[PDB]
Design a protein around this ligand. Structure first.
Ligand SMILES: [Mg+2]
Ligand SMILES: [Mg+2]
Ligand SMILES: [Mg+2]
Ligand SMILES: [Mg+2]
Ligand SMILES: [Mg+2]
Ligand SMILES: [Mg+2]
Ligand SMILES: [Mg+2]
Ligand SMILES: [Mg+2]
Ligand SMILES: [Mg+2]
Ligand SMILES: [Mg+2]
Ligand SMILES: [Mg+2]
Ligand SMILES: [Mg+2]
Ligand SMILES: [Mg+2]
Ligand SMILES: [Mg+2]
Ligand SMILES: [Mg+2]
Ligand SMILES: [Mg+2]
Ligand SMILES: [Mg+2]
Ligand SMILES: [Mg+2]
Ligand SMILES: [Mg+2]
Ligand SMILES: [Mg+2]
Ligand SMILES: [Mg+2]
Lengths: 149, 125, 72, 224, 129, 144
RNA sequence: ACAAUGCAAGGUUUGUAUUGGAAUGGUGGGAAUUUAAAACCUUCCCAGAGUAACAAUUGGAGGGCAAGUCUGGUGCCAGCAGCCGCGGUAAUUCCAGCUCCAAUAGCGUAUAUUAAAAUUGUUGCAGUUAAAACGCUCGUAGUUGAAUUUCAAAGAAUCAUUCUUUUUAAAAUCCGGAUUUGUUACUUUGAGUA
RNA sequence: AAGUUAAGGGAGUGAAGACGAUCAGAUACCGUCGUAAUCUUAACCAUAAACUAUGCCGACUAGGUGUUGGAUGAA
């Protein structure tokens, strides 16, 4: 684990066969449409994937549709400006900051806030290095709260 | 200016000056081949040693490397000339197998002693 | 030129002062069950004996021959 | 010189049931009696005799309620000068007795050491075959094989041991306290021992086994 | 974390040899590692090995002949010129008569002797005895 | 892990640590600090000439019992006062209370030698005659 | 140096005290030459060793470390001793004499330096307790960074191996044939260096 | 932890201090009393045998007895 002393290995691990299984009836177009609908309804990539797995009969959008789900969202144009994980981190940070504002003496929270900030800065940096974030994007503790939306 | 007439040490000293066995060996050598000091022995060791070093270096290179064939061959020839090897033992692995006796044999005094001329080594000298 | 002995299991090859290491000798059968004259041989190094894998190694060796039949 | 042999191997060796000490080494047998070793290396019959030396007689004190109580550890290296080296230790009250004990110990130890070659094989092996390294206590020594004309580059003690072993040409190292002579000696011995137990491309061959003295002559031992 | 897969694999192999295993599961296969293994096989030290393809970094399992004394990586893959080789080999491997010092060389990976024969030295991966 | 970095491009760290650490080596520090020239009577030299100021005794280290015969001398070079032990069975009297003595080290760089407490110097010539020669006596006699 | 006897030891020969003829530099003087002129070098001719006075020293002999528990003197004094130590009336250590040992026309002492030093550690140190893991985490530079992209295949020589030849895709170029295809590190050949 | 600064708080404990003993002496150990501190609030401090005296990430190697927290199966 990047920050704790946590060393767990709980993980999804996908099956050997990566051409979709026989029982999968859904044609790709339908699944794409479903994905789009889910996106519209406010769900994030991971969440969307989960929904697809559970509510509909489909293991992996990658086996049914050549593309992964983020890619298809992008194609359809409903991709977030601000990437999933990063966004989540930002939200968490914001929450922490609110708590701090409320409740000044919380040392552990402060420590954890610092850690989350650091992680954001890593993630943020990575995104900048690609082209998902713009280069003009620092993350600010003052702004942050407004950013998430 | 200084002269350009360069000069060189012919003999290295021991290292460990009162090792018994070595000393005894040296003394034996002196006895046998009528030598004046340990210095003579040291000088001959040095002479031998350079050659040995060269041989070692050559062996580190492979056969039909130009250097090995040329320089090694030359060395071998020199050894032959000196009366260190002769007919049977001319292969560059053999020039390592030289010892001090081999070299001392070819000293003039020793030769003289061998080929009649004088009753002794000392006498020959 | 004494060529030392190769542990038949692990091939480690075993020196003079090993002791420990053993040359176990297995006697053959001839149809009836009676002791045939011949003897099939395994040297076992000390290390394996110390470990306790020795028995396993022996079993494997037997399997490789025909002497016993289960492997593990 | 006659002695009533106790052990089976010894008994066998009493008569000409064994060719060489090589055979006994091969089947990793525990030599108990020094008499066996003596029999294998006599001045008559045999070629190279066992030249010995008291490399160190260190005095060693126990400190009882009434003063000191000195014993003398003797170390001895014993050596064929060709293949077989041995290294014995004995702590005893008198010096001579200790020395005597140590020679016996050395004989018991006596190990075959593989001499090999540097570079390529010409007449008769001379150096160690490969870099072998023993440790005992702090002192760890790494004999490295050398070319022919080199002597044993190494400490006096190491030189002494190596001549006995029958290595002519080597390169010593020595990490650790070499002033502690006994340990150094032990390390050297260990290194020497390692020479057979190394497993070179030479020895990939799986040559079928020889029969041990105990099965080949079991019938002859039933008489006694 | 991982850094040099190959090094780890070699360490594992060495450990297996020490124990006296027979089989051994080298856990992330790598082209380089495979090449190394092949080389080893060629010079007799290793038996068969069944590079098992997952759908990821593969696993190898490798069949051992009880024959390796040590095998190793020498990290910092030092560039090594053809003249510089000899000293390096002296430093490393136990005898001039045997052991192998494996270089990655612009003519694929090969041992020091091979390199010498060719003419090109290169970067030095590892070795065995 | 080793402790040290063994990267291919690591050289800067490797050099730099060594450069800093060298200074922990006592001998190296002695060689390369500038206080050598400052804080040393001979000022980086084999010997020095000093006129004598006082013939003096120095009591030895506790186990041994002697009064070692020293000479407190003033270096002409440096204006430094130093005790220099004088060898010989009776070689204090071979020198005068004001004699141009030539004094060497004792054998241990600065570090003091043997029974003597803090006398780091060995007078080895008086009025240009060799102390050793005088001691032998068959060789020479002190000119004055 | 050599040979005689005398003496010695060894399984007749080596070794070592009397003699005594051979050898020869050195040293002295002439030349020949050398050299700008001399001087040396070498060269020849006269001179010319037996205590071959034509005289070997230097530093050591407790250990480290080769060599004395030899003789007198000193008596925790003087002194020696790089270090450990020696000296308090047997000092194997001082001061001597004798004998021995080492290196020897050299041999000591000092200061510096290299090796010894894997005691600065790239190779190559150590960090529970010996000196040494920052109180802890984050963190920039720094160093380090999973796997993945043409794998392979066949023929001839040699003593399972070595060295060689041939083809297995795509694009541009040339009259179905034939021939170019990321950058740098790295490496190989060169070139050019007093 | 002590310590510092400022507000409260102030029971017990209790550096200081005071006696009582103890002892040749006792400015200590034992006892009685007893400020500072201990407590909170808001700052400083930035150190401890801050000790697993074991830097962190990684791979491998060997069994058993457990134990905290989940998951899987079966009784
Ligand atoms: Mg981290
Ligand atoms: Mg993990
Ligand atoms: Mg001029
Ligand atoms: Mg001695
Ligand atoms: Mg001295
Ligand atoms: Mg006396
Ligand atoms: Mg004396
Ligand atoms: Mg040094
Ligand atoms: Mg070194
Ligand atoms: Mg150290
Ligand atoms: Mg400590
Ligand atoms: Mg820590
Ligand atoms: Mg960084
Ligand atoms: Mg990679
Ligand atoms: Mg506090
Ligand atoms: Mg407080
Ligand atoms: Mg207050
Ligand atoms: Mg109160
Ligand atoms: Mg109270
Ligand atoms: Mg601290
Ligand atoms: Mg600590």
């Amino acid at each position: 684990r990047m920050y704790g002393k946590g060393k767990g290995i709980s993980s999804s691990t996908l099956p050997y066969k990566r051409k979709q299984p026989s029982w999968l009836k859904q044609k790709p177009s339908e699944i794409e449409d479903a994905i789009i609908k889910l996106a519209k309804k406010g769900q994030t990539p991971s969440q969307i994937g989960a929904t697809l797995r559970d509510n509909y009969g489909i293991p992996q959008v990658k086996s049914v549709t050549g593309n992964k789900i983020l890619r298809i969202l992008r194609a359809q144009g409903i991709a977030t400006t601000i990437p999933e994980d990063l966004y989540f981190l930002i939200k968490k940070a914001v929450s922490m900051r609110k708590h701090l504002e409320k409740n000044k003496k919380d040392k552990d929270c402060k420590f954890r806030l610092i850690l989350t900030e650091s992680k954001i800065h890593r993630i943020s940096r990575y995104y900048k290095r690609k082209k998902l974030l713009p280069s003009n994007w620092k993350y600010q503790s003052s702004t942050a709260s407004a950013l998430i939306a | 200016p200084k002269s350009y007439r360069n000069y060189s040490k012919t003999a290295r000293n021991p290292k460990r000056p009162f090792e018994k066995e070595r000393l005894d060996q040296e003394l034996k050598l002196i006895g046998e081949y009528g030598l004046k000091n340990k210095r003579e022995i040291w000088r001959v060791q040095y002479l031998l040693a350079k050659i040995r070093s060269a041989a070692r270096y050559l062996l580190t290179l492979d056969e039909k490397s130009s250097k090995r064939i040329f320089q090694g061959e030359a060395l071998l020839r020199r050894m032959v000339r000196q009366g260190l090897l002769g007919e049977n033992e001319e292969k560059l692995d053999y020039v390592l197998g030289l010892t001090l006796p081999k070299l001392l044999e070819r000293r003039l005094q020793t030769k003289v002693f061998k080929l009649g001329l004088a009753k002794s080594v000392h006498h020959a000298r | 030129i004494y060529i030392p002995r190769k542990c038949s299991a692990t091939s480690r090859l075993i020196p003079a002062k090993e002791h420990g290491a053993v040359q176990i000798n297995v006697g053959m059968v001839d149809a009836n069950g009676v002791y045939n004259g011949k003897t099939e041989t395994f040297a076992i190094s000390g290390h394996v004996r110390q470990n306790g894998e020795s028995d396993a190694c022996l079993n494997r060796l037997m399997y490789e021959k025909k002497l016993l039949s289960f492997q593990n | 010189k006659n002695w009533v042999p106790v052990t089976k191997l010894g008994r066998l060796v009493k008569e000409g049931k064994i060719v060489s000490i090589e055979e006994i080494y091969l089947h990793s047998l525990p030599i108990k009696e020094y008499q066996i070793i003596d029999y294998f290396f006599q001045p008559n019959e045999c070629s190279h005799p066992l030249k010995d030396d008291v490399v160190k007689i260190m005095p060693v004190q126990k400190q009882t309620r009434a003063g000191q109580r000195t014993r003398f550890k003797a170390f001895v290296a014993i050596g064929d000068g060709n293949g077989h080296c041995g290294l014995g230790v004995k702590c005893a009250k008198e010096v001579a007795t200790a020395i005597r004990g140590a020679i016996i110990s050395a004989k018991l130890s006596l190990i075959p050491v593989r001499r090999g070659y540097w570079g390529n094989k010409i007449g008769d092996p001379h150096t160690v075959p490969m870099k072998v390294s023993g440790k005992c206590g702090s002192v760890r020594i790494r004999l490295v094989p050398a070319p022919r004309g080199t002597q044993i580059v190494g400490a006096p003690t190491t030189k002494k041991m190596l001549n006995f072993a029958g290595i002519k040409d080597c390169f010593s190292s020595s990490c650790g306290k070499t002033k502690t002579k006994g340990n150094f000696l032990r390390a050297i011995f260990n290194a020497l021992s390692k020479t057979y137990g190394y497993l070179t491309p030479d020895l990939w061959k799986v040559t079928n086994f020889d029969k041990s003295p105990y099965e080949e002559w079991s019938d002859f031992l039933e008489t006694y | 974390v991982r850094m040099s897969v190959l090094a780890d694999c070699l360490k594992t192999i060495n450990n297996a040899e020490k124990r006296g295993r027979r089989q051994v599961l080298i856990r992330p296969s790598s082209k380089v590692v495979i090449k190394f293994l092949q080389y080893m096989q060629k010079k007799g030290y290793i038996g068969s090995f069944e590079i098992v393809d997952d759908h990821r970094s593969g696993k190898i399992v490798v069949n051992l002949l009880g024959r390796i004394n040590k095998c190793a990586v020498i990290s910092p893959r030092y560039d090594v010129k053809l003249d510089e080789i000899e000293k390096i080999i002296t430093s490393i491997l136990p005898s001039r008569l045997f052991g192998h010092l494996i270089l990655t060389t612009p003519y694929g990976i090969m041992d020091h002797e091979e390199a010498r024969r060719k003419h090109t030295g290169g970067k030095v991966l590892g070795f065995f005895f | 892990g080793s402790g040290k970095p063994s990267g291919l491009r690591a050289a800067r760290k490797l050099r730099i640590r060594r450069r800093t650490q060298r200074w922990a080596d006592k001998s190296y520090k002695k060689s390369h600090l500038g206080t050598r020239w400052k804080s040393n009577p001979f000022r980086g030299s084999s010997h020095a000439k000093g006129i004598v100021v006082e013939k003096v005794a120095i009591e030895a280290k506790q186990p041994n019992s002697a009064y070692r015969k020293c000479v407190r001398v003033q270096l002409i070079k440096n204006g430094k006062k130093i005790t220099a032990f004088v060898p010989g069975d009776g070689c204090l009297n071979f020198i005068d209370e004001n004699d141009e003595v030539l004094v060497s080290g004792f054998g241990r760089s600065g570090h003091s030698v043997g029974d003597l407490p803090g006398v780091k110097f060995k007078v080895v010539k008086v009025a240009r005659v060799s102390l050793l020669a005088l001691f032998k006596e068959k060789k020479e006699k002190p000119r004055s």
